Amino acid sequence: QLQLQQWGAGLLKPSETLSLTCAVYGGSFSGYYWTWIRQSPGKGLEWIGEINHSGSTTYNPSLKSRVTISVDTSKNQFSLKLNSVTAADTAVYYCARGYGDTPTIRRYYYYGMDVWGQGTTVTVSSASTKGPSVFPLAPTAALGCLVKDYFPEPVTVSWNSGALTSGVHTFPAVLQSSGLYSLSSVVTVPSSSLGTQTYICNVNHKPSNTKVDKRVEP
Amino acid sequence: ADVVMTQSPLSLPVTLGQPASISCRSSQSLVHSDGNTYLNWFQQRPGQSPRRLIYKVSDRDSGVPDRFSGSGSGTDFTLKISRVEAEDVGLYYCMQGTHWPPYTFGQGTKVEIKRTVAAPSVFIFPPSDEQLKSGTASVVCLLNNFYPREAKVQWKVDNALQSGNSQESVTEQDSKDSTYSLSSTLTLSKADYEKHKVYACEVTHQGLSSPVTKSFNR
Numbered sequence: 269q270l271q272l273q274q275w276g277a278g279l280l281k282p283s284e285t286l287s288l289t290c291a292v293y294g295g296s297f298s299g300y301y302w303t304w305i306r307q308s309p310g311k312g313l314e315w316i317g318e319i320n321h322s323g324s325t326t327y328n329p330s331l332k333s334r335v336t337i338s339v340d341t342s343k344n345q346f347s348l349k350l351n352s353v354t355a356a357d358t359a360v361y362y363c364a365r366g367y368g369d370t371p372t373i374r375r376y377y378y379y380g381m382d383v384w385g386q387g388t389t390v391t392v393s394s395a396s397t398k399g400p401s402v403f404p405l406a407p408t409a410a411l412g413c414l415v416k417d418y419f420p421e422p423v424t425v426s427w428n429s430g431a432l433t434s435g436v437h438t439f440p441a442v443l444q445s446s447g448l449y450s451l452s453s454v455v456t457v458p459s460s461s462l463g464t465q466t467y468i469c470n471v472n473h474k475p476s477n478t479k480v481d482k483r484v485e486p
Numbered sequence: 487a488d489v490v491m492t493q494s495p496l497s498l499p500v501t502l503g504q505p506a507s508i509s510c511r512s513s514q515s516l517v518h519s520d521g522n523t524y525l526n527w528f529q530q531r532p533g534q535s536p537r538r539l540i541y542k543v544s545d546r547d548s549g550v551p552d553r554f555s556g557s558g559s560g561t562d563f564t565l566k567i568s569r570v571e572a573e574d575v576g577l578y579y580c581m582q583g584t585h586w587p588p589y590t591f592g593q594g595t596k597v598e599i600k601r602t603v604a605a606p607s608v609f610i611f612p613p614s615d616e617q618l619k620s621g622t623a624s625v626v627c628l629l630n631n632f633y634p635r636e637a638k639v640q641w642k643v644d645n646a647l648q649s650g651n652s653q654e655s656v657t658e659q660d661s662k663d664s665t666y667s668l669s670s671t672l673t674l675s676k677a678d679y680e681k682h683k684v685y686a687c688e689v690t691h692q693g694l695s696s697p698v699t700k701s702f703n704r
Contacts, residue, residue, distance in 0.1 A: 329588065375522055381528075382538045437630070452671070456630060
């Protein structure tokens with residue numbers, strides 16, 4: 269079957285230009301529209317634009333003033349450039365195979381958003397790299413760790429170096445108004461385990477070389 | 487004028503093995519001048535690209551289980567799952583390929599696993615003494631292992647209801663017990679924290695016949 273592999277930087281600052289590329293394998297480069305689509309929690313799925321083998325583009329009217337889509341037939345690749353980005357452009361971006369590029373193919377062939385790239389997670393933010401401050405949430409009992417004010421994603425959170433996994437909930441990161449992320453991780457344990465067992469949250473943030481082992485106790 | 491695609495319901499809890507039905511209406515006829523009706527359905531499993539299940543209303547993509555079927559005409563469309571199985575949890579979208587640009591998607595339907603009502607065990611956590619030095623305070627309210635998803639938290643500080651000073655996060659449905667957990671995070675500018683004494687969050691859920699409250703003071 270046809271396969272699409274995509275790449276490009278996903279961590280951007282406002283006013284930068286998003287630049288993604290998609291390579292095509294396992295099928296002809298002709299016969300159908302090369303397509304870009306994005307997905308964000310807020311707006312769902314949005315068609316950005318398309319291009320054919322011959323270089324003819326069609327864009328989404330709400331984006332057309334900031335979109336360029338191009339094709340390189342000597343490499344079976346196609347590209348997206350989205351200029352002047354803001355936080356509102358934060359999304360997962362996909363390349364895909366569109367409908368047949370003639371009336372006949374469109375009418376009689378199965379093609380039409382049926383093959384997709386793996387996606388590129390794109391975040392737009394003015395923030396510089398910052399490591400988290402880690403605070404304990406002290407106490408069947410519950411306890412955990414507040415992991416505050418970091419950029420970029422992700423942090424990794426474990427408990428007692430991976431030994432503790434049962435009853436653990438690590439919440440998804442929230443973007444704070446400051447432009448930095450925050451999350452919490454919690455565990456429930458038997459109340460009788462407090463006098464016998466020690467709990468430590470291990471929080472790693474590779475970008476800032478942050479490594480914190482925060483004990484959580486009564 | 488862009489074609490509006492309206493899916494229903496936004497959330498669909500299904501009992502395992504039971505049928506499931508997703509609606510999609512368009513604001514304009516989807517019948518194309520070439521006589522075809524261009525309506526597709528997608529399944530998206532977490533962290534993966536959308537997968538096309540159905541194209542041109544009722545044509546099933548190859549490799550797709552026959553428990554999936556699409557139907558309808560004109561402006562009214564329906565995806566049906568005869569027997570919902572474990573691997574069918576996730577997001578489903580319709581897409582019209584008749585009027586473009588732009589192609590438009592539905593806002594998505596989240597298929598989740600229905601189980602019996604489970605009340606949240608609630609825990610409240612005070613700001614840490616280590617955090618208060620940074621000139622800000624965070625009070626966390628935890629609602630653990632509850633079903634269904636729909637919950638309500640209200641912050642009380644000196645018995646005053648708060649507004650807009652809190653962010654929520656939810657876990658994905660647990661793989662083993664099918665429950666949720668939720669964090670509520672109270673953000674205070676320290677001065678507002680020491681100014682008041684008694685802290686409490688009040689959780690309202692289906693599983694509780696009456697709002698439960700955890701508390702502390704300092």
